[PDB]
Paper text:
β-Glucosidases (Bgls) convert cellobiose and other soluble cello-oligomers into glucose and play important roles in fundamental biological processes, providing energy sources in living organisms. Bgls are essential terminal enzymes of cellulose degradation systems and attractive targets for lignocellulose-based biotechnological applications. In this study, we report the biochemical and structural analysis of a Bgl from the hemicellulose-degrading thermophilic anaerobe Thermoanaerobacterium saccharolyticum (TsaBgl). Bgl cleaves β-1,4-glycosidic linkages in disaccharides and glucose-substituted polysaccharides and is involved in the utilization of polysaccharides as an energy source in cells.
Numbering used by the authors: 1 to 444
The structure:
Amino acid sequence: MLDFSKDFLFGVATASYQVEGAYNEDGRTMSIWDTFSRQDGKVYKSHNGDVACDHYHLYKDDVKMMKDLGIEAYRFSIAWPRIFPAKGQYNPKGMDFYKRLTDELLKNDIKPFATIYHWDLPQWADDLGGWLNREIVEWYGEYAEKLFSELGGYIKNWITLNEPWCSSFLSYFIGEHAPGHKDLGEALLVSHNLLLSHGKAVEIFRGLNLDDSKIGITLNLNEVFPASDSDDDKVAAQIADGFQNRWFLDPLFKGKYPQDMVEYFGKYAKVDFINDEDLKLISQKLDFLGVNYYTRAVVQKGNDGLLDAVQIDPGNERTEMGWEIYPESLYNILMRLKREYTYDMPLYITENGAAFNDVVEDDGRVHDEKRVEFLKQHFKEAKRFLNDGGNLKGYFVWSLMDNFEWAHGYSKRFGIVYVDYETEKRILKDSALWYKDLISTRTI
Ligand code: NA
Ligand code: NA
Ligand code: NA
């Protein structure tokens, strides 16, 4: 009768540094991203999040806009540098923003999903070594415990980390993201300290025994296809799958790093951070897994160097990120989790969406028909997973609004709502009107 049950959550998602602005107001100190965006050549045209969408000031208009679309759940992140702008120094004015935001969501029948860490590490923590310093587990634990104690009556759905693959490999190996190191050993140790920090928050959360409250983690996952049936392309796909997916899924859900990748990485860097006590903390039972899905990878063996797979273009339609539009991988990844990792545990899609070349036409509208078709194809796969016995509880579109897309600055637009940055005007895109209809009819 309904493709999506009344209890299924239709959501949208943002992140603190990507939308809030007010970067130096009410006691906020710099994050690693405020620092990184001011380093020459790190971010497109030296864009930064000083102002972004001005969501800090415009949050009531943004909540009313979500209520008018019929949004059922809102995923956002909490900015560590607003809450602890200096080590051990709590900022009540910081916490007050997240109380007024969550109060506005609950009064407009929107369920809050709060990401504790979405990449805006305080500069003070980075200056003490940041994710390379195992003491960060205690600093993160103190931060998480404060959020649980102050906001536990406001928020019942908690996500420890967003995309630890990005905070580790993209930030410390590839160097695209803050703080922008280029060292495999650092990226591997950071991946471990991120997961241990997740573990510490889970341990704290369970000790609080919070009424009807749930905790999880968000991972960016893909599907890797070999370019051919050759043994060479099979190993290339195995390594690329180990690098993106299994390096995080295995410690979290099996309590062991993937042994093929430990051996592979061990040829190039130290993997001596692995121990039983830490893996027990990392693998504590979660209430749900958040999946961030955008695209697949088709790979062929490269020159036998470190993670040097050649990226094959299979000749299909792509977004403005150059990401293939391949909706079948959404179903394939959710089934893989049901069969191999999460079994009957609740899953959410915590991000899915696309960047297109959006323009405001002379009629004042944004006719983003490619984003309408993108979302339609991916929701149809979510429906297929549900109809095949999948435990999918909700789907959060990335993003509510166009925002600061990290190293790309404002040059990539992911919103269902267009933002004219000169005026901070919000314009509903045709994708927003399509989504409003999907929530209302629950039919696709
Ligand atoms: Na910002
Ligand atoms: Na800048
Ligand atoms: Na678990």
